[PDB]
Amino acid sequence: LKQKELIANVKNLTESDERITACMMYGSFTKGEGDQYSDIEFYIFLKHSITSNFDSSNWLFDVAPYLMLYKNEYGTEVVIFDNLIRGEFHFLSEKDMNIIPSFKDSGYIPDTKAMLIYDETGQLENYLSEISGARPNRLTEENANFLLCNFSNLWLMGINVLKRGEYARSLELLSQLQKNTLQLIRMAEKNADNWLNMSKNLEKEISLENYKKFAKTTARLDKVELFEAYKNSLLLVMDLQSHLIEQYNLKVTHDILERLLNYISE
Amino acid sequence: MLKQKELIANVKNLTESDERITACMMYGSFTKGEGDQYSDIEFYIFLKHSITFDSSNWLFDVAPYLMLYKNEYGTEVVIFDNLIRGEFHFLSEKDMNIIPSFKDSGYIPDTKAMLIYDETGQLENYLSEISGARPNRLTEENANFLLCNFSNLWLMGINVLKRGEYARSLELLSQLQKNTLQLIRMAEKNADNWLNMSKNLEKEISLENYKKFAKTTARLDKVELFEAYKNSLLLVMDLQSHLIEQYNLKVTHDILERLLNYISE
Ligand SMILES: [Mg+2]
Ligand SMILES: [Mg+2]
Ligand SMILES: [Mg+2]
Ligand SMILES: [Mg+2]
Ligand SMILES: [Mg+2]
């Protein structure tokens, strides 16, 4: 893979460059899930006193020639190499390495070995032992209640703008409630490790039954398809709620969802 | 009388008589002349510093509600028992100074309708700072970010699509759609509705671009997803050919064409 060649380049450069103290890889190439369609992604930790004016534009071209480079909304350097492989590079001071422990709240990290690319002082290796084996429990009454409330809120807002005739806006809201729906399916089916990245591997991770029901909650920009998608997403959530009520105390009840159902006609 | 106007009246009544409340500010469509039967209601409630308060008790006094939670942004969101949606921020009076920053997020046509209650006169003072104001979205910085962000998300979305991660590509497509709407609004110079880029879209962009945008949408289906991604790129190619004449752009026609060629690769 071209991306494994780029990874080896990153490993080579981060170890030899005096400006760089540590390098941590994340994403699919750290979990055995990388393929030809994958990106590459790293945190690059810099010597504190040169962090501000670090020439990332030049350094990244030293990794490989690129077509395009920009800083995204979260302050990550995002690159498209001339071979069309995407790379995400988060440049921070060595002193901000203390953000690493918070990564234990973000997902399943069974192994940490592929994450350590370079570690000058030993401190990256210690931070990673803090997150190794992390596995947040998503199957909580708090998640189920937040998701059902959020869904009801988004669904009602979406149906309102749809009734108004704001079709594009109801479509945008529909995509937000789809994300909510995936997390709920993952709760109902107890396959919730892919939590923030809820659509990742969906085709391999959920029952055909719920996958098809989810497919029915999608729509193109068209009034009839939108009304159909909204009704189906409420019907799906009604199914998910009757399952989740067996294991959690829910503030959103069938009678509340029933009020939303009757509203579509009004 | 709209159900929301009776609720607004109740909010006015309660905030002006409660000793714990220093000020009340309304925002959204009912302060922009766009409120209707499908609208929600929304307010910042500013509290005496020492008591910053049980919101659920107070909100029940506005009207009985079916559900109340805090959204991902810390806002209290309520569905009243007549199905009207309300969004309430409870903050200390000392946070009233966030008000001048509102001119950074959009056009402020009517600060008179925004003032619900103002014990000290300070709310009116902050509001007068933002009256008539709006950001100018028509910049090289915006065109560059959006074209770059689009290309990033498009390449990522097309990759997961080729992998056969259909639901993931659909999620990314909706992120692309938002970028595309901002780009259309730049190209057509109608950019007030920026953060809320879908707002009044049917009324605010040309029919030609609306129909092009409609072709960038898909259901959860391989064929429809490929069609949407292709059309997404072709629309952006149209847009940057307009944008290149006004701004110096990092994303060139040649780059977009390499992306177009990649669809079949
Ligand atoms: Mg990745
Ligand atoms: Mg990535
Ligand atoms: Mg509103
Ligand atoms: Mg609102
Ligand atoms: Mg009471």
CATH number at residue A197: 1.20.120.330
Domain identity same for B87 and B177: no
Domain identity same for A128 and A37: yes
C-alpha span between A133 and B253 (Å, rounded)? 46
For residue B192, how many other CB atoms are within 10 A of its CB? 15
**Helix runs in A66-131, H state only:** 123-131
Q: How far is the CA of A39 from the centre of ligand 2 (A)?
A: 6
* Distances, alpha carbon A234 to alpha carbons A230, B170, B230, in Å: 6, 19, 31
Q: Is the separation of the CB atoms in B199 and B191 below 8 Å?
A: no
C-alpha span between B17 and B24 (Å, rounded)? 12
Cβ–Cβ contact B66 with A under 8 A: yes
Q: How many domains does chain A have?
A: 2
Domain identity same for B80 and B188: no
Q: Is the separation of the CB atoms in B239 and B184 below 8 Å?
A: yes
CATH of residue B73: 3.30.460.10
Long-range contacts of B50-55, Cβ-Cβ distance < 8 Å, separation of 24 or more = B51/B20, B52/B90, B52/B91, B52/B92, B53/B20, B53/B90, B55/B88, B55/B90
Domain identity same for A115 and A141: no
C-alpha span between A242 and B175 (Å, rounded)? 31
- DSSP code for B264: T
Query: Among partner residues B85, B152, B177, which is closest to A156 by beta-carbon distance?
Result: B85
Chain position carrying tokens 């959690």: A248
Domain identity same for A177 and A254: yes
Q: Which of B108, B135, B162 is the C-terminal boundary of a domain?
A: B135
Q: How far is the CA of A78 from the centre of ligand 1 (A)?
A: 12
* Distances, alpha carbon A7 to alpha carbons A18, A123, A128, A239, B147, in Å: 19, 21, 19, 45, 27
Task: Mutation target for A interface from B140, B166, B215: give the one with most A CBs within 10 A.
Answer: B166
CA-CA-CA-CA dihedral for B243, B249, B253, B258, to nearest 10: -140
Strands A66-71 vs A116-119: parallel, antiparallel or unpaired: unpaired
Domain identity same for A224 and A158: yes
CB–CB contact B66 A259 (8 Å):
yes
Q: Name chain A contacts of B146, Cβ cutoff 8 Å.
A: none
Domain identity same for B131 and B23: yes
**Which tokens is A257 given?**
């969802």
Read off φ and ψ for residue B220, nearest 5 degrees. -75, 85
Q: Which of B135, B159, B186 is the C-terminal boundary of a domain?
A: B135
Q: Which of A116, A136, A156 is the C-terminal boundary of a domain?
A: A136
Domain identity same for B141 and B127: no
Domain identity same for B141 and B260: yes
Q: With b meaning 16 or more CB within 10 Å and e meaning fewer, what string describes A190-208?
A: ebbbbbeebbbbbeebbee
Resolution in Å, one decimal place: 2.1
Domain identity same for A18 and A147: no
Q: Is the separation of the CB atoms in B70 and B76 below 8 Å?
A: yes
C-alpha span between B6 and B29 (Å, rounded)? 16
Give me the domain span that covers residue B201.
136-265
What DSSP element (H or E) covers A190? none
What residues pair up with B245 in beta bridges, in sequence order?
none
What residues pair up with B80 in beta bridges, in sequence order?
B65
Domain identity same for B117 and B143: no
Contacts of B22 by beta carbon, 8 Å cutoff, 6+ apart:
B46, B47, B48, B93, B119, B120
Chain position carrying tokens 């730049």: B186
- DSSP code for A45: E
Half-sphere exposure (CA, 13 Å, Cβ side) for B188? 20
Domain identity same for B6 and B76: yes
